[PDB]
Amino acid sequence: MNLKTNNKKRLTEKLIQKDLHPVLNKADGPVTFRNDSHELNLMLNDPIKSTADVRLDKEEVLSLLPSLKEYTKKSKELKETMGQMISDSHEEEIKEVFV
Amino acid sequence: RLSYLRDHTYPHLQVSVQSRDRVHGIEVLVVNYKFCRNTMNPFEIQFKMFYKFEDSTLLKWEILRISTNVRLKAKQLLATRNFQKCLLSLYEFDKIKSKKTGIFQNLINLLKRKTRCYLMNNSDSLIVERVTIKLQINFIITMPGECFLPMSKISIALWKGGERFNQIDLDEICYGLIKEYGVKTGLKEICNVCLFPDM
Amino acid sequence: MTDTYNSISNFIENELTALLSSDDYLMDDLAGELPNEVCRLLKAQVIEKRKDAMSRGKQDLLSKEIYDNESELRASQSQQIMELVGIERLIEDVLKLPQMDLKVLSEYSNLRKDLILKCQALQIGESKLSDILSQTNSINSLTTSIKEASEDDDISEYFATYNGKLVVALEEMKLLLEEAVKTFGNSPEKREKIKKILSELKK
Amino acid sequence: DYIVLENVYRMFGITFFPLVMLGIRLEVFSERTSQFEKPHYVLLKKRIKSNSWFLFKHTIPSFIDVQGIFDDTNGGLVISHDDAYLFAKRVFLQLVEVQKRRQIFKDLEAKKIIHDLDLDLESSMVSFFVKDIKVELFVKQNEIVSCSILDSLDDLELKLNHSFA
Amino acid sequence: GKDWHDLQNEQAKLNDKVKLNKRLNDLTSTLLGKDSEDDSIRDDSNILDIAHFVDLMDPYNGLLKKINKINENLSNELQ
Amino acid sequence: MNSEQLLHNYVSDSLLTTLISFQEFKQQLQSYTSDEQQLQHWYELLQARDARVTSELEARIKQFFITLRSRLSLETLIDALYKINDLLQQRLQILDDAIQEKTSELAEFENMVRSPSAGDNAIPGLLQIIQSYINLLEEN
């Protein structure tokens, strides 16, 4: 209880960090996040779990899983294959000429 | 009695029964359900279902016709053979799409003067260009896999004009900004960082 | 065990000697930019306020408290690692095992790094699979859509003749619009036709 | 006439019955038995001096909290009915995962792998008899935290049959 | 009890947000003075592309059904 | 709340600006010296020196901490760690095998819906029809 009151002034001296806009609103900020994470069913871009002084070697990860190297090239083949199929449709031209 | 459960329990939903019939013990119901949130292009669905008239039990349920908007989206959903995961997962989809388009429209209203801002997809992706910095906020609503609720996946993508930066670190940035702000003020802080003339 | 606390005590005394040499470093930094008599006076106020701040008993008490905290940290480490002798619980217990008989220690560190790599790649692959599952779900929905729509099971040629149907529908629309323009010629009829054309085109 | 209308209203599983006040009615449809669950009633009262809803009466089991989660959204600002729908959705998700666990227990009982059971209100100290070794398990939400063998919750069926042979 | 848990959460989130503030300082220096993505670890273009792909050529909605619902309606209004 | 910030509290309260403020030696150097305006300058010099000693102290503190924790049954955990290493790679093989089926599915779909046809020829017809429709709408 007493150490919590000792920590409140730590919050006050903390909240004057070097940022003009993005630290000047959280003086109902995180409770808004916990309110709309469930209302939108929001789990956003989930951060990768703690590095713990070991750098996130993506090269070692792609070496350990050989499937994703084929998945990305199959996806690239699909995209380059039928983006041209989109370009033969003129949906944007129709949307421009109508609305 | 009727009016409160008609509208305030499930806002922007149109419920209406089409036909009732009784055979001999099975009772057949034909009904249509319309989610009228996006009134520019609303979407409805029609079902045919069966009871006993005592201990009302759904033996079989079949799809008569779905509206043109969601007849593909409500087909991968409707393979679970469970209505409570098929009609509690459509209203939430409609509400999530409404919140997505409302957030994007409110972000247009705060950037249409200084910068330029449009929608790359129908309502999924929003692109803001300034000065020549570019920001793109993606709001993906995809159906449950085959939990059961619709899947919302907020993403960001920032170009300085010449090149793209890393996605993992900006994802951590988005995580922090939404975490201590929320979806609206967090993205407002992100586009303020996109401006960064003073703040 | 007590040799660890002895080394902590000697390093604490070494850091106190570092602090007094740093005080002398204040003394010869302020020399030249300040008068040396002023330097001696401020040294005197350092003696009568700041020198007695590092009391001999207080630093040893702090060293003993640090040693006790390190011993209870080692005890807690032992408790978690002996619990770890016996899916997300595994990754959790791995990310709370600490970082460190030289060969066993080196191999522990090396395989600890190589196993943090596996633990990280686990949720990397999990997120990738969660994306690809939704992709395949939408693709399968489209394929069964075109399968039971035409009821002909020739959906491979459906994506090749869509351009022809598209352009003949556009040609029929153009002919109908030209006939309406050359036939009706009325402002309200043209306004209603334009409204009906632009209503379902995008909205 | 109206009877089919309350059936249409009740198939959802979340309904709000007006009162002079509110009442949230919750039911979970079972896919196996093709029948609804017991109706859970949450009679919700509005504060006069604070202008915010608070719990008056609950028919929830003691395992599921309707107060801690109730103040977990919007900082207790439950004035809007959207936040009430959020609370209803969260407790419905908890109810359907608890019902899934109970249905797994009932399915494993119907498979006759074990003997007669005694299910509790919290689905933690559910006891059953095995041919030689009677095992008690301390289990959280879809997760066993202790397997007290003396003589993922679904993954039990992965390994208990392994213990059976 | 709960107080020590709150203190532990505090000590965690302080270093979290100061690392965050250093990352915002680094990106602000990068942006005003001038990080890249050239791999396949987590990229979001796939699902956006697929969701556009299916909605453009949906045999139920697509464009051909919309263009048909335009032109046959116009013919009905004309004839 | 561990021992390193205990050292930080022990060094921060024994730093010169703490209970010896600017006004303190300002009053102590009123008639003692003549450089009254340079007291402030020496004061930001004091903050600079304090600021980089309070950054270089962490180097030695964390160096000795990692040295003592590096010098901290014993060989029993090695076999368990190989057990965990063999468990998780086989566990990830399941996800890799699940990904292989999906990527083969999408690769089959991509060649199933490819149409090496005259899309550009139809594109000119659609553009001409759109231009005629635009002309008619402008005339409307």
Residue numbers in the entry:
A (entry chain Q): 277 to 303, 320 to 391
B (entry chain P): 153 to 176, 179 to 285, 293 to 307, 314 to 366
C (entry chain Y): 1 to 86, 110 to 123, 136 to 238
D (entry chain O): 162 to 181, 201 to 331, 351 to 364
E (entry chain U): 233 to 266, 277 to 321
F (entry chain Z): 1 to 72, 86 to 153
What text does the study give?
The point centromere of budding yeast specifies assembly of the large kinetochore complex to mediate chromatid segregation. Kinetochores comprise the centromere-associated inner kinetochore (CCAN) complex and the microtubule-binding outer kinetochore KNL1-MIS12-NDC80 (KMN) network. The budding yeast inner kinetochore also contains the DNA binding centromere-binding factor 1 (CBF1) and CBF3 complexes. The inner kinetochore centromere-associated inner kinetochore (CCAN) complex (14 to 16 subunits) associates with the centromere, generally through specific recognition of CENP-ANuc.
Previous studies identified an interaction between the essential N-terminal domain (END) of budding yeast CENP-A (CENP-AEND; residues 28 to 60) and the essential S. cerevisiae CCAN proteins CENP-Q and CENP-U. Reconstitution studies further showed that a CENP-QU module can transmit force from the outer kinetochore to CENP-ANuc. We also present a structural explanation for how the CENP-A N terminus (CENP-AN) interacts with CENP-QU. Unexpectedly, the CENP-AN binding site on CENP-QU is autoinhibited in the context of the assembled CCAN. Paradoxically, in the context of CCAN, the CENP-QUFoot is sterically blocked by an N-terminal domain of the Nkp1-Nkp2 dimer. (B) Cryo-EM map of the CENP-AN:CENP-OPQU+ (COMA) complex. In this structure, the CENP-QUFoot and adjacent coiled coil, including the CENP-AEND binding site of CENP-QU, are mobile and not visible in the cryo-EM map. In our structure, the N-terminal domain of Nkp1-Nkp2 is bent back, so only its middle region binds to CENP-QU. The remodeled Nkp1-Nkp2 releases the coiled-coil domain of CENP-QU, rendering CENP-QUFoot accessible to bind CENP-AEND. Although the CENP-QUFoot is not visible in the cryo-EM map due to conformational heterogeneity, this structure, together with the AlphaFold2 prediction, explains how CENP-AEND can bind CENP-QU in the context of Nkp1-Nkp2 and in the absence of CENP-LN. The CENP-AEND–bound CENP-QU could represent a CCAN-independent axis of inner-outer kinetochore assembly.
